[PDB]
Amino acid sequence: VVKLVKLTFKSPVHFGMKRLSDSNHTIAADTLFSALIIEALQQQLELSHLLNNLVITDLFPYNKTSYFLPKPLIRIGYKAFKKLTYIPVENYSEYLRGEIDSLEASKIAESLNLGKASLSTKVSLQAVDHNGESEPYSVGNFTFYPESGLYFLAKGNADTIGQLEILMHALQYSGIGGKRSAGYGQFRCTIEDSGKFDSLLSQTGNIAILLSSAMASDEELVDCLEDARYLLKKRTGFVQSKTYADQLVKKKDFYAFSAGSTFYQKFNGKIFDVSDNGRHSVYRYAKAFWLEGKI
RNA sequence: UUCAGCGUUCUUCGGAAUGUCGCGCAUUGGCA
């Protein structure tokens, strides 16, 4: 049951990539899954549905004009083609067939208006009272245009879909990304049946494109890599919880194929464990959502 | 010789702001 989940952001979001100063306009499926797990644990729900039947996608840019999917890594002005990152759903088939030209790719890049990124310079006055000093730091945020929003597609049974609806409503108050609970990431989310995507997903093409940041199991990896065009993205971070350890602990470093990576042989994903001797297992979504296309 | 005032100017010409600062310091950065 693939359900579109559109997110409208009221306040700017941080979405850090490596540092607090930087910012991204989207987040990986794992970052969303980790937020969904944290929420389910707060609301005292069973994690079996999320860990066994929920399939999600990286949040993708959406505009009133169009919904943007990630640019497939398919061999085809090379600058114009490399600058392009997201292609509207209507132009995805044209891009796959090679019917797109460099000027058309430039127009597609200009078409997206997800938002306007910025850097907010904050200060910490915690040490001023102890003969210390104010400490400047920078938070990179991204402000969506009013029509613009981030959407994700969630697939699963009816039970996990309803659980997702509950977690999503709680999540909007919780927020997403970094510096949430410090002014950022408040969003309001709608869950609906989308005719566009379900029709798009009902295609049996010769190539498979990874909607979500995903990694195959070892046995899956050996068949999948042959003839694959892909971009290994390091997935790293600290553990966010009150019960994992007394102090803040980094997760084990993970590498996942990025969204838009094209694999000839489809691989199902796996919820990996990036924990290192903690009081609970830190789950890292790496399951795979596939858009089959014809090239 | 008496009887009366009547007309014309109602303000004018200059000067209309000027000079001086136009953010500084601390954290940060930089050097070590």
Curated annotation (Swiss-Prot):
GO molecular function: RNA binding
InterPro entries assigned: Csm4, Csm4_C, RAMP_III_fam
GO biological process: defense response to virus
Lineage: Bacteria, Bacillati, Bacillota, Bacilli, Lactobacillales
Protein name (record): CRISPR system Cms protein Csm4
Name of a matching Pfam family: Csm4_C
Quaternary assembly: Part of the Csm effector complex that includes Cas10, Csm2, Csm3, Csm4 and Csm5.
Family classification: Belongs to the CRISPR-associated Csm4 family.
Alphabetic keyword roster: Antiviral defense, RNA-binding
Additional remark text: Encoded in a type III-A CRISPR locus.
Role according to the record: CRISPR (clustered regularly interspaced short palindromic repeat) is an adaptive immune system that provides protection against mobile genetic elements (viruses, transposable elements and conjugative plasmids). CRISPR clusters contain spacers, sequences complementary to antecedent mobile elements, and target invading nucleic acids. CRISPR clusters are transcribed and processed into CRISPR RNA (crRNA).
